[PDB]
Nucleic acid binder design. Structure first.
Ligand SMILES: [Cl-]
Ligand SMILES: [Cl-]
Ligand SMILES: [K+]
Ligand SMILES: [Mg+2]
Ligand SMILES: [Mg+2]
Ligand SMILES: [Mg+2]
Ligand SMILES: [Mg+2]
Ligand SMILES: [Mg+2]
Ligand SMILES: [Mg+2]
Ligand SMILES: [Mg+2]
Ligand SMILES: [Mg+2]
Ligand SMILES: [Mg+2]
Ligand SMILES: [Mg+2]
Ligand SMILES: [Mg+2]
Ligand SMILES: [Mg+2]
Ligand SMILES: [Mg+2]
Ligand SMILES: [Mg+2]
Ligand SMILES: [Mg+2]
Ligand SMILES: [Mg+2]
Ligand SMILES: [Mg+2]
Ligand SMILES: [Mg+2]
Ligand SMILES: [Mg+2]
Ligand SMILES: [Mg+2]
Ligand SMILES: [Mg+2]
Ligand SMILES: [Mg+2]
Ligand SMILES: [Mg+2]
Ligand code: NA
Ligand code: NA
Ligand code: NA
Ligand code: NA
Ligand code: NA
Ligand code: NA
Ligand code: NA
Ligand code: NA
Ligand code: NA
Ligand code: NA
Ligand code: NA
Ligand code: NA
Ligand code: NA
Ligand code: NA
Ligand code: NA
Ligand code: NA
Ligand code: NA
Ligand code: NA
Ligand code: NA
Ligand SMILES: [Sr+2]
Ligand SMILES: [Sr+2]
Ligand SMILES: [Sr+2]
Ligand SMILES: [Sr+2]
Ligand SMILES: [Sr+2]
Ligand SMILES: [Sr+2]
Ligand SMILES: [Sr+2]
Ligand SMILES: [Sr+2]
Ligand SMILES: [Sr+2]
Ligand SMILES: [Sr+2]
Ligand SMILES: [Sr+2]
Ligand SMILES: [Sr+2]
Ligand SMILES: [Sr+2]
Ligand SMILES: [Sr+2]
Ligand SMILES: [Sr+2]
Ligand SMILES: [Sr+2]
Ligand SMILES: [Sr+2]
Ligand SMILES: [Sr+2]
Ligand SMILES: [Sr+2]
Ligand SMILES: [Sr+2]
Ligand SMILES: [Sr+2]
Ligand SMILES: [Sr+2]
Ligand SMILES: [Sr+2]
Ligand SMILES: [Sr+2]
Ligand SMILES: [Sr+2]
Ligand SMILES: [Sr+2]
Ligand SMILES: [Sr+2]
Ligand SMILES: [Sr+2]
Ligand SMILES: [Sr+2]
Ligand SMILES: [Sr+2]
Ligand SMILES: [Sr+2]
Ligand SMILES: [Sr+2]
Ligand SMILES: [Sr+2]
Ligand SMILES: [Sr+2]
Ligand SMILES: [Sr+2]
Ligand SMILES: [Sr+2]
Ligand SMILES: [Sr+2]
Lengths: 53, 132, 337
RNA sequence: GUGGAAGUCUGUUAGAGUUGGUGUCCUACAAUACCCUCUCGUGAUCUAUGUGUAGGGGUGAAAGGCCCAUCGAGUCCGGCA
RNA sequence: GCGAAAGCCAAGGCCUGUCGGGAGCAACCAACGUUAGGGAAUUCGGCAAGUUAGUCCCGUACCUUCGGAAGAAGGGAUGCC
RNA sequence: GGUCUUAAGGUAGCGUAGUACCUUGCCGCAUCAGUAGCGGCUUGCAUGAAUGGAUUAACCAGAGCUUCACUGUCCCAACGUUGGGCCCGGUGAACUGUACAUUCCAGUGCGGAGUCUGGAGACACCCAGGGGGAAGCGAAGACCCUAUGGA
RNA sequence: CGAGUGGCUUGCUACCUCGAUGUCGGUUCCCUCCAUCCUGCCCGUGCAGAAGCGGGCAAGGGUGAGGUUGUUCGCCUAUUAAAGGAGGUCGUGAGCUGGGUUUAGACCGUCGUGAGACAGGUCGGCUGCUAUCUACUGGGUGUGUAGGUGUCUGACAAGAACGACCGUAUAGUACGAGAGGAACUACGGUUGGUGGCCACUGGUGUACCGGUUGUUCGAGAGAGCACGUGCCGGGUAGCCACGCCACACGGGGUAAGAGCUGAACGCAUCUAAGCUCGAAACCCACUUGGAAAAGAGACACCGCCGAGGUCCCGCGUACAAGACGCGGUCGAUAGACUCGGGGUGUGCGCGUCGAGGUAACGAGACGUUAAGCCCACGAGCACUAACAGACCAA
RNA sequence: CCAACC
């Protein structure tokens, strides 16, 4: 699996899946990614992200 | 009860206010008790994903308000662990009103439900729009 | 009306003092059933990682499905059964009778003992066999020691010595089985004793925490609400009633916590290999890299990294063995992060 | 719009005071202290110095409060062993 | 900055709110920071802690001695160039 | 009762009250559940008109109750910060002390014993600790009674 | 109606204490009793079943959360296997609380001519002490047994180390007209308790990296102060729980009870002798401590001119002193350095752009730049420091 | 209940 936020692969037996109100799903590989998303930042505007790179 | 299929960290206690994810006319539910549960001195009774709970209606239609009913926890903010190690968490805490047979009192469910809850309460599941 | 409540902490692991031997000492051994065989082995804790396994359980709704399982990596290099000690039965229980030693000794076994220079393996053997004919022979055990040098992550070179009972078929047969091992060089391995999938009891001296208060040491409550601001935060209510006029040893008090021997039962051995498959990127924190004989124990094992852990065939297994579980993945992801 | 009243409001301005913590201290820094919170702050306001009222007497928006760590009758010595 | 407010800084003063040395420095205590989910269930009692907060615009109920209630409530805005 | 004591015999109001013993009075509201609180009823053990009654906008570090918001008050505790605590140099008190004293379980005894009796246990010394006991220390009990005591 | 036991209530007495043994309720923490609420095993039934009702053994474990009230008790609510009662100075203020009670202020009702009174009500109202002995929790030094190293034994000691529930199969079966509706056994899970561990999730993380407000160092750069981080965002190690792991079966002897053989008493009789069974209870199993067990232990090897040990040195798997453990060139023990593995989030400088502006100037954007900065971890590497050296010892 | 006088 890939992190729906930064793009790196999610190490198996790791990460969290956030279930949105509308039923959508977001697989996060770590708190760092979750926390940046909570801040409202879009992964594409964050240089260190695979998505951005 | 039948094994849930995942490990749960109860995210609710007696007195917690949660969303009633159905169309029974009840908007907000207050946790009163947890079926089958027995704690320890000073411990606040806790409930989480998959538990059957007794509830009182805090917000909703006049006819529903103040009624003491049974419900089933379908969503919670505190994470749960699935067999493959991944944690799963929802946007809110919610339960579905249920009768003596565990069939939803309502006709429709609102929002997603955890698959694990489907296992336990099939009829509840056969009302779900989204199962995650 | 003063609700009931179980007491704080167990009274079965006391006194809660500092352990005498950092090397664990089993106080029980498996029963004699199969063929003769050494009833235990040892290794050094390295760290933890996780592995995805195929549900083995025949009674599980998930039999045959992917399952992430926590694993503690223990480096289990070969050990050396250096001698055979015999116990005789007496009115006062078991007592050591004699020992049959060898000639080949690991180069650094002299960092712990005064290695024998003149010994008679036959006079010893003779006395033992006469003890059996007489019917005064108690169990039979092997003086065993580790080879710290084989483990680069562990600084010690001084071998750790422990006695491990030998059980098995008939005494005559396992006595002979014992003598064989010893004579060679005593060099035996984890494979020789355990098979991936079996259940083992692991013993070890827990991580030390020095002095700690009742809250942490015994799990007593902290003072609550207003009672937490008057000058007492982590002190128990009272040391006892007016009468008896003394403090019972059962009331939770401060003291040594940690560095105690513990024997953890029914730990499933997930895999016994050799190499660096289990090692983690960057190296196990505060340990180093693994690349040699190793064992993957299901879950946690008492003790800090580098401590000596001991294995024994589970003496009270709850479940039947499900040999060689299928491992589809072993995480090697850095442990720093 | 002007005007700028008020035992008027906010205010750690100065200054005065002290609701709660039943916090700290309790052989104290201190025989009444410390910290935060809190109240008043143009007036029956606060404050310095000078001056007056003296013991069954003063003084008291009254609590038997205060009259030099002492008050339901000060202190000192005497009556007095 | 509204300011004799906070905070920072001059002139000027000081290192004397006068015992030091050492241990990643344990338990425990005094002050205090951060705590997932639940959110007063704690307690005699929300005690303690916290929440809110400056300024501008919109808007503001019962009641009233018509003064007031009122900053009611509720809503929005706020930097830099 | 349909006057009598002793002059009159409680009017307007308010009322289970900061006054009601009975009492958690009864009805309702609110809560899952409310000896609380608010409204109403009210025969008031024992309300009531300047011994002021009622009422009341504004004010209040005054008493009680409810809601929204918020939170380590709690579930259930964790990690961290500063000063102590611990070790070292120097300085250097006080409280308290009939004697003996390593105690524990029972008993006995002026009936609430480390010291008496019977047993049990107990090698000496030292460090840290939280305070079970010494009916611990501190104050010739502020209660109660007694005194041909005081004010 | 008669006979008792207890010492939880109340009363009675005045034996102890007035040169003081602090008073209710609660809280916290520990031990206990059984007259047993649940759980185990039984007997009876107005016992079909399911379930009730009553009785017996039994104290291993459990007996919880909430609303009014200071309340105890009690009333009430939803859960529960059940939400039992009682003793320990009505256990527990040199532990906490201070609501009640219980001074000095004040009010109401009633009483009193009055001062003033009221286990009547009401608002406010003060809790000292550096532990000598003893007790216990943990940590040391000595002596005894009587040169050293290593390994054990097990007298004793502690444990609840485990208790309980739900679900599935059995089975819509036995039973019953139907309604209703089991069990043995095999399984999965939950809960309370217990011990340990950090790969995972979560917290912290005044290491660290970044953003940014005020002010000062002229600007820039780089910094100080704003409480021991100004504020905000992220977060490594470590420590943690909200995370993860593990915590039987089986034996032996019994109680109540079910029986066998069996006589006194030819019969009968579970009992008098004998015996087969039978509880979560007892013992063992399992875990933990344990040569100071004075019968003061056992074995093996080393050594008595030398085994071993101490000082010393580098350090932590250890740690408040002490103790403990590892390494010391026969060496990777610590540091430096370089890699690897991590944290943050794209450095200074310069170039282009940039709303405008004559220009000066200009917030900011892009590139250089997966940059810069940083790391309590790992590897490599003797570069530096584990040197030199002193001493005890049958 | 109760923590004195009633
Ligand atoms: Cl409940
Ligand atoms: Cl407490
Ligand atoms: K007395
Ligand atoms: Mg409680
Ligand atoms: Mg990590
Ligand atoms: Mg990770
Ligand atoms: Mg004057
Ligand atoms: Mg939190
Ligand atoms: Mg409560
Ligand atoms: Mg407050
Ligand atoms: Mg009323
Ligand atoms: Mg009149
Ligand atoms: Mg006196
Ligand atoms: Mg008096
Ligand atoms: Mg007089
Ligand atoms: Mg008397
Ligand atoms: Mg006393
Ligand atoms: Mg009985
Ligand atoms: Mg018991
Ligand atoms: Mg008492
Ligand atoms: Mg006491
Ligand atoms: Mg006290
Ligand atoms: Mg004290
Ligand atoms: Mg009160
Ligand atoms: Mg009061
Ligand atoms: Mg009185
Ligand atoms: Na205090
Ligand atoms: Na006491
Ligand atoms: Na005008
Ligand atoms: Na004050
Ligand atoms: Na006078
Ligand atoms: Na000085
Ligand atoms: Na009157
Ligand atoms: Na006032
Ligand atoms: Na806190
Ligand atoms: Na004491
Ligand atoms: Na007087
Ligand atoms: Na009696
Ligand atoms: Na009490
Ligand atoms: Na029991
Ligand atoms: Na109650
Ligand atoms: Na007492
Ligand atoms: Na007190
Ligand atoms: Na008390
Ligand atoms: Na048995
Ligand atoms: Sr051993
Ligand atoms: Sr043992
Ligand atoms: Sr206090
Ligand atoms: Sr006593
Ligand atoms: Sr004014
Ligand atoms: Sr003011
Ligand atoms: Sr006070
Ligand atoms: Sr405070
Ligand atoms: Sr004082
Ligand atoms: Sr003015
Ligand atoms: Sr005076
Ligand atoms: Sr005189
Ligand atoms: Sr200056
Ligand atoms: Sr000086
Ligand atoms: Sr932080
Ligand atoms: Sr509350
Ligand atoms: Sr409450
Ligand atoms: Sr606003
Ligand atoms: Sr009337
Ligand atoms: Sr004696
Ligand atoms: Sr102390
Ligand atoms: Sr006395
Ligand atoms: Sr009995
Ligand atoms: Sr039963
Ligand atoms: Sr009552
Ligand atoms: Sr009582
Ligand atoms: Sr009690
Ligand atoms: Sr009071
Ligand atoms: Sr009362
Ligand atoms: Sr009174
Ligand atoms: Sr002697
Ligand atoms: Sr069933
Ligand atoms: Sr049916
Ligand atoms: Sr600072
Ligand atoms: Sr702010
Ligand atoms: Sr019998
Ligand atoms: Sr000995």
């Amino acid at each position: 699996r890939e992190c729906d936020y930064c793009g790196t692969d999610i190490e198996p037996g790791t990460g969290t899946m956030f279930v949105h109100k509308d039923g959508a799903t977001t697989h996060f590989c770590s708190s760092k990614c979750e926390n940046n998303a909570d801040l409202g930042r879009e992964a594409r505007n964050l240089e260190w992200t695979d998505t951005a790179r | 009860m039948e094994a849930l299929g995942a490990d749960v960290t109860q995210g609710l206690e007696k007195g917690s206010l949660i969303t009633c994810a159905d169309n029974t006319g009840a908007r907000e539910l207050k946790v009163i008790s947890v079926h089958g549960y027995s704690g320890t001195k000073n411990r606040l009774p806790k409930a989480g994903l998959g538990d059957k709970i007794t509830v009182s209606v805090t917000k909703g239609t006049p006819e529903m308000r103040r009624q003491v009913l049974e419900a089933v926890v379908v969503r919670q903010r505190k994470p749960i662990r699935r067999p493959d190690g991944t944690r799963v968490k929802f946007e809110d805490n919610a339960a579905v009103i249920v009768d003596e047979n565990e069939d939803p009192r309502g006709t429709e469910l609102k929002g997603p439900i955890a698959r694990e809850v489907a296992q336990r309460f099939g009829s509840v599941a056969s009302a779900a729009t989204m199962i995650v | 009306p003063q609700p009931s409540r179980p007491r704080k902490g167990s009274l079965g692991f006391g006194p809660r003092k500092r352990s005498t031997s950092e090397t664990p000492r089993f106080n029980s051994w498996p029963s004699d059933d199969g063929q003769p065989g050494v009833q235990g082995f040892a290794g050094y804790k390295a760290g933890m990682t996780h592995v995805v396994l195929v549900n083995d359980e025949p009674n599980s709704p998930r039999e045959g499905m992917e399952e992430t399982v926590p694993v503690t990596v223990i480096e289990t290099p070969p050990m050396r059964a250096v001698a055979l000690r015999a116990y005789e039965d007496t009115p006062y229980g078991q007592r050591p009778l004699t020992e049959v030693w060898t000639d080949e000794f690991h180069s650094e076994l002299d960092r712990t003992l005064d290695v024998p220079e003149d010994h008679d393996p036959d006079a010893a053997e003779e006395q033992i066999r006469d003890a059996h004919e007489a019917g005064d022979l108690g169990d039979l055990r092997l003086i065993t020691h580790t080879v710290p040098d084989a483990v680069p992550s562990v600084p010690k070179k001084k071998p750790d010595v422990m006695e491990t009972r030998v059980g098995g078929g008939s005494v005559s047969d396992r006595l002979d089985h014992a003598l064989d091992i010893v004579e060679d060089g005593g060099e035996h391995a984890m494979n020789d004793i355990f098979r991936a999938g079996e259940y083992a009891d692991v013993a070890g001296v827990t991580k030390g925490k020095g002095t700690q208060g009742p809250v942490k040491r015994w799990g007593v409550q902290k003072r609550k609400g207003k009672h937490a601001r008057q000058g007492w935060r982590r002190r128990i209510g009272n040391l006892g009633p007016w009468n008896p006029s003394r403090v019972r040893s059962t009331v939770p008090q401060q003291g040594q916590t940690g560095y105690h021997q513990r024997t953890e039962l029914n730990k499933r051995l997930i895999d016994i290999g050799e190499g660096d498959e289990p090692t983690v990127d960057g190296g196990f924190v505060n340990y180093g890299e693994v690349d040699g004989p190793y064992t993957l124990v299901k879950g946690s094992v008492p003790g800090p990294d580098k401590r000596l852990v001991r294995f024994r065939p589970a003496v009270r297994p709850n479940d039947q063995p499900r040999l060689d579980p299928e491992v589809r993945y072993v995480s090697n992801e850095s442990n720093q992060g």
